[PDB]
């Protein structure tokens, strides 16, 4: 809608981006190289001298005919793991957004005793070194497990529940965005009769859509890639997340680099999709024409 200019500025940026991309893609193109290289080598040529498809076939389920004659079936259900990674991250993110968002609304629109104490308590208490945390978590889900079995050990429920602990930052993030939306939009709502919840859901959320997408994206990523907690809690191979599962490729003396790199690339895929979908929620000027001033 606005009139645009020198279009050398586009040209110079297009070039300074392309060079930036190449520089930051190069470490990743190295990984795709490893996943296509035959055998398991952490280092070789970018376009490998000896390219194999066996690593990607075993990740995708296909059986492999080796040199001596015997067919190698897939050792692991790499795909199922990826499906488990999605269910666990996805539901978890839905849960993180939902919790941090309602929590945020109260910190930003409501007033109650010890608001600054809790908000600064949240920021501080999450920044504690989580070193002996795993010794504590196991003890919780072991206990919890006999009372509610659905959220115990070896359950996807338990894993999701563990991740719903880290909202402190996200609360801060959504609290912030909320504050840049004009108050008088919710006042107008209130005078139309809307309860605080209705104001939150029908007026405020729809305008906070971009930051909610951000929180969802940041959760999803965190959870696809998370290893320690999930590796500690899940025990059945067919319940493993793709992160937890690819730990099998890592051993005392050697790594199965090829198999591992192929797994590492797949875990980038669900993120790429989710990130792409969240775009329809990342729009400018949602407040446009609301308030005069």
């Amino acid at each position: 809608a606005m009139v645009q200019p020198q279009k050398a500025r586009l040209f110079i940026t297009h070039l300074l981006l392309l060079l930036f991309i190449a520089a930051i893609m190069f470490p990743l193109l190295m990984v795709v190289a490893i996943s296509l290289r035959q055998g398991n080598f952490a280092t070789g040529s970018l376009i490998p001298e000896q390219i194999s498809w066996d690593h990607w076939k075993l990740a995708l389920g296909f059986s492999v005919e080796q040199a001596d004659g015997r067919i190698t079936p897939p050792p692991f259900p790499v795909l199922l793991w990826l499906w488990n990674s999605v269910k666990v991250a996805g539901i978890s993110a839905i849960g993180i957004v939902a919790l941090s968002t309602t929590c945020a609304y109260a910190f930003a629109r409501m007033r109650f005793p010890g608001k600054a104490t809790l908000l600064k308590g949240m920021l501080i208490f999450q920044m504690f070194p989580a070193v002996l945390s795993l010794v504590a978590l196991y003890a919780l889900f072991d206990r919890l497990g006999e009372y509610i079995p659905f959220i115990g050990l070896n359950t996807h429920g338990g894993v999701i529940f563990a991740y719903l602990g880290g909202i402190a930052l996200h609360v801060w993030t959504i609290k912030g965005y909320f504050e840049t939306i004009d108050s008088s939009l919710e006042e107008a709502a209130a005078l139309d009769g809307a309860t605080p919840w209705q104001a939150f859901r029908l007026v405020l959320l729809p305008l906070s859509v971009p930051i909610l997408a951000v929180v969802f994206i940041l959760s999803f990523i965190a959870a696809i890639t998370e290893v320690p907690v999930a590796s500690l809690l899940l025990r059945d191979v067919n319940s493993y997340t793709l992160a937890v599962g690819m730990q099998q490729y890592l051993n005392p003396q050697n790594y199965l680099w090829g198999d591992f790199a192929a797994a590492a690339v797949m875990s980038a895929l669900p993120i790429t999709i989710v990130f792409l979908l969240a775009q329809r929620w990342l729009v400018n000027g949602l407040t446009a024409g609301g308030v005069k001033g």
Partner: protein, 490 residues
């Protein structure tokens, strides 16, 4: 709107589960889990009860999770610091006593046994390998503690030797049979193959002392160090060893030892500097990109947008190791390229400052998308007409950024930069994988390096350094470096 009485039925049925689950936890033995579950539900139901706690209805569901999976582990960590929980003292007292009470020593001879069906009754045979003498018992019934008298025999038993399957099925009933030789020796089943003179090494007294059946030494619980010790104390202590509360010993040890203190401050500088520079860089790189990508004149933006966040998509562990490959000093593609153009090989692992630089390049590489994704959403909150106003005040792209975009972003971004500082301050992993804290800080009694973070130099004392895996020390230090990053958040 639903029924008005429908809410009190939901509140009553929850006030049922709570109370039922509370009493059910009080039984068998889960008490700490009961005190904490009552207060949490009480608060939870009271908040949703009266229409005056409305604000807390939004905050409580969130805080519940935080208290449970953030505060609770933090408390546990602190709680452990007051104790000697470690590799050496890992078991509870009950568990360490239990382990010593399973310990047994070989006192008598060893006879390969067989089982023989005598009609519906059983018959036991033993075989003394050392004298070539054999022994056979009367027909007996299973179940319970009984004593079988064995007679010296030349004959074979009439029954056909029993399966390992049958031995295994009847193993329980078998383990209570005390077989007695003609010479008058107590012998019991040590394995599925043998009967022997195995007897417990220790026996529980009454006042709480363990005496040894083989040596004759008496041992007493020394609740200062957490071991059994000879007696008044002697000089021999027995393992396992149990966890005992040691007041302040692990907190003081960090203040006690000159040696673990020599490189402290010099490291503390690097950790703070390392963190600030990363925070500054990631935010700056992330913010510009975010601005560049939402700029509507650009025609590949949807592709650039995606490709830019990919460093965050591929799990960091493998990325970091690939960076270790590229930054190699003689081999490795970075110094291959830097040798053709420019014609210099930088000492990325050897030289302290270039390493510190490498580490920052890589940390920026891993972390820029995060800050970008944040600014991607955050930017959408700046109304368009603010830049229409700047157009009428004659502002360009650069002027827009510094007078409008950036000031509007700093206020929300602030707590996400403070947290980023806290995270990178404790960024144990990146260092360990890439440099291992190297190169060497020559002359450190307890080992340190120039790229070592404070948490790196620490967990090498608490987990390496040869003294087992002292968790009590690790928790003491963690509590201290939290209090420092607390007094740093000022």
């Amino acid at each position: 709107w639903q029924s008005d009485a429908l809410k009190w039925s939901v509140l009553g049925l929850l006030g049922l589960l709570v109370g039922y689950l509370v009493v059910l936890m009080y039984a068998q033995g889960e008490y700490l889990f009961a005190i904490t579950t009552l207060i949490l539900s009480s608060a939870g139901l009271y908040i949703f009860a009266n229409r005056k706690a409305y604000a807390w209805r939004y905050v409580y569901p969130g805080m519940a999770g935080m208290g449970l999976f953030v505060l609770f582990p933090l408390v546990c960590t602190i709680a452990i610091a007051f104790t000697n929980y470690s590799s050496t003292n890992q078991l509870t007292f009950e568990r360490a006593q239990e382990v010593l009470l399973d310990r047994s020593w070989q006192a008598g001879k060893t006879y390969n046994f067989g089982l023989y069906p005598a009609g519906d009754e059983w018959q036991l045979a033993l075989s003394d390998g050392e004298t070539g003498k054999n022994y056979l018992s009367d027909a007996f019934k299973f179940g319970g503690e009984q004593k079988l008298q064995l007679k010296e025999t030349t004959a074979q038993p009439e029954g056909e030797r029993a399966n390992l399957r049958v031995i295994t099925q009847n193993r329980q009933a078998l383990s209570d049979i005390t077989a007695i030789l003609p010479d008058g020796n107590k012998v019991m089943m040590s394995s599925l193959r043998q009967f022997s003179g195995t007897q417990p090494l220790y026996t529980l007294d009454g006042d709480g002392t363990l005496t040894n059946n083989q040596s004759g030494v008496k041992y007493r619980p020394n609740n200062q160090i957490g071991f059994y010790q000879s007696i008044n104390w002697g000089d021999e202590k027995l393992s396992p060893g149990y966890t005992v509360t040691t007041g302040w010993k692990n907190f003081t040890r960090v203040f006690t030892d000159e040696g673990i203190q020599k490189p402290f401050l010099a490291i503390f500088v690097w950790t703070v500097v390392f963190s600030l520079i990363t925070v500054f860089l990631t935010v700056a790189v992330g913010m510009v990109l975010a601005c560049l990508v939402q700029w509507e004149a650009l025609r590949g933006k949807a592709v650039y947008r995606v490709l830019l966040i990919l460093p965050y998509a591929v799990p960091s562990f493998i990325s970091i190791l690939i960076f270790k490959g590229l930054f190699n000093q003689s081999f490795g593609e970075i110094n291959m390229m830097l040798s053709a153009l420019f014609g210099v090989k930088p000492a990325w692992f050897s030289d302290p400052t270039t390493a510190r630089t490498m580490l920052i390049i890589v940390n920026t590489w891993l972390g820029y998308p995060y800050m970008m994704i944040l600014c991607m959403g955050l930017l959408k909150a700046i109304p368009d007409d603010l830049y229409e106003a700047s157009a009428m005040d004659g502002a360009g792209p650069f002027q827009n950024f510094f007078k409008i975009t950036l000031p509007l972003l700093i206020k929300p971004l602030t707590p996400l930069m403070i947290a980023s500082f806290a995270f990178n301050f404790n960024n144990f992993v990146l260092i360990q994988l890439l440099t291992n804290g190297g190169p060497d800080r020559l002359g450190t009694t307890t080992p340190a390096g120039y790229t070592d973070l404070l948490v790196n130099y620490t967990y090498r004392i608490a987990f390496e350094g040869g003294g087992g895996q002292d968790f009590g020390l690790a928790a003491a230090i963690a509590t201290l470096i939290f209090l420092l990053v607390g007094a740093l958040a000022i």
